[PDB]
Amino acid sequence: AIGLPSINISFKELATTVKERSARGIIAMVLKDAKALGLNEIHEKEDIPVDLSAENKEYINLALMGNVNTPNKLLVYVIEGEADIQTALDFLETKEFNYLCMPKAVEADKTAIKNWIIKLRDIDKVKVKAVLGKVVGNHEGIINFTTEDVLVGEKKYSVDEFTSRVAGLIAGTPLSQSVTYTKLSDVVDIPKMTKVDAESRVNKGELILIKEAGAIRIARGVNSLTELTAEKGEMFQKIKIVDTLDIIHSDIRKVIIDDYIGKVTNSYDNKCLLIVAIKSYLEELEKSALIESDSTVEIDFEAQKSYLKSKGVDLSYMTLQEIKEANTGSKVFLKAKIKVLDAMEDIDLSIEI
Amino acid sequence: MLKYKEILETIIEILKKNFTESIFIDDESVQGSEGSCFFVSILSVICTPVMLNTNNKDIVISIKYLPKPQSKSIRMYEISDELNKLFNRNIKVTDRKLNITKLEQSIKKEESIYVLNFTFTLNYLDSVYEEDVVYENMKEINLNLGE
Amino acid sequence: MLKYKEILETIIEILKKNFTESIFIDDESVQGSEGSCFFVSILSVICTPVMLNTNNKDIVISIKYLPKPQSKSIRMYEISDELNKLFNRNIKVTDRKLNITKLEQSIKKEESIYVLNFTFTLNYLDSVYEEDVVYENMKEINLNLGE
Amino acid sequence: RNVMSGTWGELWLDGNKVAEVKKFQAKMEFTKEDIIIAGQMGTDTKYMGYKGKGSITLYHVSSRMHKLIGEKIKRGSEPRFVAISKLNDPDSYGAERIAVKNIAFDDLTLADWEVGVKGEIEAPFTFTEYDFLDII
Amino acid sequence: RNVMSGTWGELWLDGNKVAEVKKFQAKMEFTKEDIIIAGQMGTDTKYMGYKGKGSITLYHVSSRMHKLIGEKIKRGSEPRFVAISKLNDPDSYGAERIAVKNIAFDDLTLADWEVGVKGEIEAPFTFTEYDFLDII
Amino acid sequence: NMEARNVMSGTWGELWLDGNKVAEVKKFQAKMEFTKEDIIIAGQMGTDTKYMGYKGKGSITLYHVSSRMHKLIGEKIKRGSEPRFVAISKLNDPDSYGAERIAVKNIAFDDLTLADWEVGVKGEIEAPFTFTEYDFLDII
Amino acid sequence: NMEARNVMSGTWGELWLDGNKVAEVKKFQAKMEFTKEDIIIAGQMGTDTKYMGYKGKGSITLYHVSSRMHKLIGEKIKRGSEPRFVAISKLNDPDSYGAERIAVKNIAFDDLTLADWEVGVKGEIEAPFTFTEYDFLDII
């Protein structure tokens, strides 16, 4: 309640920082060890669990280095030496994150991780990505880094172990910039690779390292997706575009799921109202120059058509307006078109004498 | 909505309470009566749509007094005042009050005898019927974005 | 175009479904009936050209109720509401919906008895017939230019 | 062929459906300047901008406008709204919807009545940008 | 649903009930300035204030306005009043009241009559602030 | 970012003169006039200037509600002593990004208006002044 | 060739000041005033002139959205140091033949407006300046 009148002056030196962490970027790591079991968030270096082994310390320290800014937060999950990955994955479903990597792993477990990521992205429509060692997956949510025998310091780090540094570097990059041609100071040397083989390897869709210009740098920022459908775009291979799109998709959830799920009748008028709300949200993002102008939001005609054909509806002799007016039970189909600017990666200069 | 039968019943009940002479709705009974009978009918109804779901109604209600015995015109002039005293501002029909916009009265001779004709108009807004489909609440919202 | 016979048939069918009393179109049958018969007719049609190929039509449709037996005026007032319940906004004739601009109803005495007269107007645009000559596509175009 | 009748008109204002609405109207007026070019009798014009104008007319069923803008107008901050108009005549083939954004109202009518007359309220407004849904 | 009819209207002026009143009307008109922003075709507006305007119409039953303001107008001091308007139609669900404050009248009508015509007086006025009672 | 509502309006300003708030204020204006001399440098066609100082000027206009301006300086001026005042102007528009406040110091007035009236016209008094210093308080 | 639509409109311009885009800009103007001396040559009635140099002048007018002009020079002017800025103006009308861009260098301002407001009037700030050099970029 009321106390005696108080005058207190506080002196604090809030100047103890360098290479400040970005607001965005969350990395989740799952590990096998005998101690410190459970989730142990790591905000910075000073708060590191002491009971961990040397290998886990090395992996965490590798993951603690960014490109320009350090990652916002680290969620380290520790599992016992003999355990299945399903329990850790189900526990991580509750938590939210951007990237997931596991330094020590086997061939069979990578299949489970890839399957989980695909199911989460498609069935549940939650946009997360994982960085994996040698997976040949054909999905935009999978990143495979396929160079071996990286010499950081005096140790021949394995590819799976260096996926941690890859994930940290990816998380550290700001939104405006990309991860192409970024130099790694720590790395010393790479096993020999000819230029044409590296070009073909990255064309297949891979994350690699090459020695070009002054020092070692990442060849390209492509994804694992290697084939393009009519609906899918060529811009979906770039990591930066996918990251921005997933940020936007996660942000629109506070508009969609918070209010329009379970609280509003599913009628075409309410669909139009929701479309207007989404467009008005996109205008603000356009005004901040995050995306390009002229972004349109409208009803997904083809998916609605497919769902209507799934049930007992004769799609013939129906007006397009009649198709759009149809009540699709308790599900809503929407489609948006937005554009994201890529970074400068190719230059063609012609000089006339 | 509001039914015309209820309005007619309400007016007939008011006249029954306030007057001792009989009230009839049809011509044959007033013809067969011995004298001094009333007559109540709804003259006309006009419906105009002012909004999507509502109409505007103007109803003209006619009250007639036909005194058969001789030298009852003074009774007609007495009855005019008592009729005037009742229908001043509004009437209540089925827990709803309807305004009375204007009153009109005329004394004219019909066939061989003079009669009194008392009329007034009611104005109110009323809603047409419609059938509305029921939808269940939104549960799953799919949004896929591309180029 | 749209035929008046179809409109009359549609209205007659609606009345047949919703009412038990007989429906007649000619005066002789309603005269010969024993009591409580309907009467349906098209009162007037006005055609005005608003465009080169289209006309504007206003059709007034009349429904009559003539209760012959004594003490059926209350039945008339009951039937008024049921008629009102059907013709609110529009009717569907030959997969085409025609608006109902306004409703009108009046209770007047004809000959020796009182009758109910229910009317409403339909408004829609309709196209006149024309014959168009068919031409073949252009195949050869000659253009000669000089001073 | 039939022309759409205005009886089948619905209006959404600020995400709430306006049950009573007599008419709705929105227009864009262009700004042009006369330019005279040497050697030509006919005078040409250059398009330099546009203005959005419109109005609503609704019956005085409730005090909607006051609850919308009254206190904020006194405080000194002017609110902006979004209105949606839908016109769907069953006789016509299709429907039409328009979204009008950045609406600002010209005036407020506290009270207006007369003996024997049902109350009506009309409020003009000015807008900047529009978006089109379900184009015929 | 019914719309309130103006027959059920009452007015209180300066704390006295006005028995004879044909109509009452009060409105707030906003002040806006056109602003053109570089790079945009549409023109926007900035709100700068408002004005209060209204009028009354009442039968010439008595000499109310003179007893109100006549001598003070000549003396050189202008009085201000408060008016209350109530609209309660029994058919409608609820009532509505408004308090209009700081009223100043535009003119005074000493006498006006014509052969075969009942006298009517209408007096416009301007107000500054309003307060709301019994919102619907 | 830029929008019409963000533009500040003059109705929302206020002015403190000598520590007392002035309510009957119509407009307030302050400005600083720099002094620059033309300098021609050999080999260059474009002339260039050198900055040497500044001069401060302004004015206040207010409704003639009361005889405020007389009580400040009327008796002091005749005796031969000139007073110096301090004025603070605050512009706080709810729509704009906050408010800006400025203090103008060492104000000396240019003239005194004993009387000014005309039949059928409301009264107003405008007084120009000159200053030397200023502070920034809560600038946007 | 010549048509009404080809005329450039001022609504489509934009201005960068010191590398930061200014969105609340109303008008921008720059000009060069040549210096010419009259010379009378024997035997000819018509007088002829000799060109000696030029002087650059201009001004910027912008809505009073924020206190941008103070933060640039307010504290530096009092201390005795004068800053120099660079402005870029781009005029891009879709109907006209492309766009023209010009950089105006060595800009020095003439005055600073501490405060200017009046009741019922929107605020505006105009600042004149002088320059010495310029570049042509993407001239039509």
Concatenate the DSSP letters of all residues of G2-42 into one string. --GGGS--GGGEEEEETTEEESSEEEEEEEEEEEEEEE--T
3-state secondary structure of B8: helix
Q: Name the residue with tokens 């004769």.
A: A314
CB contacts of G12 in chain E (<8 Å) are 38-39
Alpha helices (H) in E5-135, listed in sequence order: 64-75
Degrees (nearest 5) of the Cα angle E35, E39, E45?
20
The answer for residues whose C-beta is within 8 angstroms of residue D115's C-beta and 6 or more apart is: E6, E7, E9, E22, E23
- Please judge whether E48 and G13 are an interchain contact, meaning their C-beta atoms are less than 8 angstroms apart: no
| D and F touch per CB criterion (3+ pairs under 8 A) | yes
- Let me know: does D61 contact D39? Beta carbons within 8 Å: no
Alpha helices (H) in chain C, listed in sequence order: 4-18, 27-32, 73-84
Q: Testing the interface with D: which of E41, E84, E122, E130 to mutate, by most D Cβ within 10 A? A: E41
Buried b (16+ CB within 10 A) or exposed e, G2-21: eebeebbbeebbbbbbeeee
Q: Name the residue with tokens 């419906």.
A: B47
What is the number of other CB atoms lying within 10 angstroms of the CB of residue A50? 7
Query: What is the SS3 string spanning chain A?
Result: CCCCCCCCCCCCCCCCCCCCCCCCCEEEEEEECCCCCEEEEECCCCCCCCCCCHHHHHHHHHHCCCCCCCCCEEEEEEECCCCCHHHHHHHHHHCCCCEEECCCCCHHHHHHHHHHHHHHHHCCCCCCEEEECCCCCCCCCEEEECCCCEEECCEEECHHHHHHHHHHHHHHCCCCCCCCCCECCCECCCCCCCHHHHHHHHHHHCECEEEECCEEEECCCECCCCCCCCCCCHHHCEHHHHHHHHHHHHHCHHHHHHHCCCCCECCHHHHHHHHHHHHHHHHHHHHCCCCCCCCEEEECHHHHHHHHHHCCCCCCCCCHHHHHHCCCCCEEEEEEECCCCCCCCCCCCCCCC
Query: What totals of helices (H) and strands (E) does chain F contain, helices first?
Result: 1, 8
- Please judge whether G11 and E35 are an interchain contact, meaning their C-beta atoms are less than 8 angstroms apart: no
The answer to whether B94 faces chain C, any CB pair under 8 Å, is no
| F and E touch per CB criterion (3+ pairs under 8 A) | yes
Q: Report helix angle A159-172 to A54-63, nearest 10.
A: 30
The answer for residues whose C-beta is within 8 angstroms of residue A18's C-beta and 6 or more apart is: none
Breaks (C-N over 2.5 A) in chain C follow: none
User: Which pair of tokens denotes residue C16?
Assistant: 């047949």
Distance of alpha carbon F99 from alpha carbon E103, whole angstroms: 33
User: Which pair of tokens denotes residue C19?
Assistant: 């009412």
**Nearest chain B Cα to C120, which residue?**
B47
Distance of alpha carbon G129 from alpha carbon A226, whole angstroms: 58
- Let me know: does A243 contact A235? Beta carbons within 8 Å: no
What's the Cα-to-Cα distance from E58 to each of A36, A122, C112, E26, rounded to whole Å?
A: 88, 73, 51, 15
- Let me know: does F7 contact E34? Beta carbons within 8 Å: no
What's the Cα-to-Cα distance from E118 to each of A53, A321, E61, rounded to whole Å?
A: 106, 61, 10
Q: Name the residue with tokens 């203090």.
A: F103
Q: Name the residue with tokens 């403190």.
A: F16
Query: Phi/psi class of residue D134: alpha, beta or left (left: φ > 0; alpha: ψ in -120 to 50)?
Result: left
User: Which pair of tokens denotes residue F112?
Assistant: 């005194």
Instruction: Give the resolution in Å.
Output: 3.6
* Residues paired with B24 in a beta bridge: B39
SS3 content of chain E, % helix, strand, coil (to 5): 10, 50, 40
What's the Cα-to-Cα distance from E134 to each of D19, D111, E27, rounded to whole Å?
A: 22, 13, 19
User: Which pair of tokens denotes residue G34?
Assistant: 């040549």
CB contacts of C97 in chain D (<8 Å) are 90-91
* Residues paired with B96 in a beta bridge: B93
D134: phi then psi, degrees, rounded to nearest 5: 55, 60
The answer for residues whose C-beta is within 8 angstroms of residue F3's C-beta and 6 or more apart is: E37, E44
Q: Name the residue with tokens 């609406």.
A: D103
- Please judge whether F4 and E45 are an interchain contact, meaning their C-beta atoms are less than 8 angstroms apart: yes
Q: How far apart, in Å, do the first and last CA atoms of chain A sit?
A: 85
Q: Name the residue with tokens 């060109």.
A: G51
CB contacts of A324 in chain D (<8 Å) are 134
| G and D touch per CB criterion (3+ pairs under 8 A) | yes
User: Which pair of tokens denotes residue D12?
Assistant: 């959404």
Distance of alpha carbon C97 from alpha carbon C7, whole angstroms: 11
Distance of alpha carbon A198 from alpha carbon A207, whole angstroms: 10
Q: Name the residue with tokens 């109530």.
A: E86
What is the number of other CB atoms lying within 10 angstroms of the CB of residue F6? 19
Helix or strand holding residue G68 (H, E) = helix G68-79
Helix or strand holding residue G104 (H, E) = strand G99-109
**Nearest chain D Cα to A270, which residue?**
D15
CB contacts of B4 in chain C (<8 Å) are 77, 80-81
CB contacts of E37 in chain F (<8 Å) are 2-4
What is the DSSP pairing of strand D23-35 with strand D44-59? Answer: antiparallel
Provide the experimental method for this PDB entry: cryo-EM
Read off the amino acid at residue A197: D
How many angstroms separate the CA of residue G44 from the nearest CA in chain D?
36
Read off the amino acid at residue A78: V
Degrees (nearest 5) of the Cα angle B11, B23, B42?
50
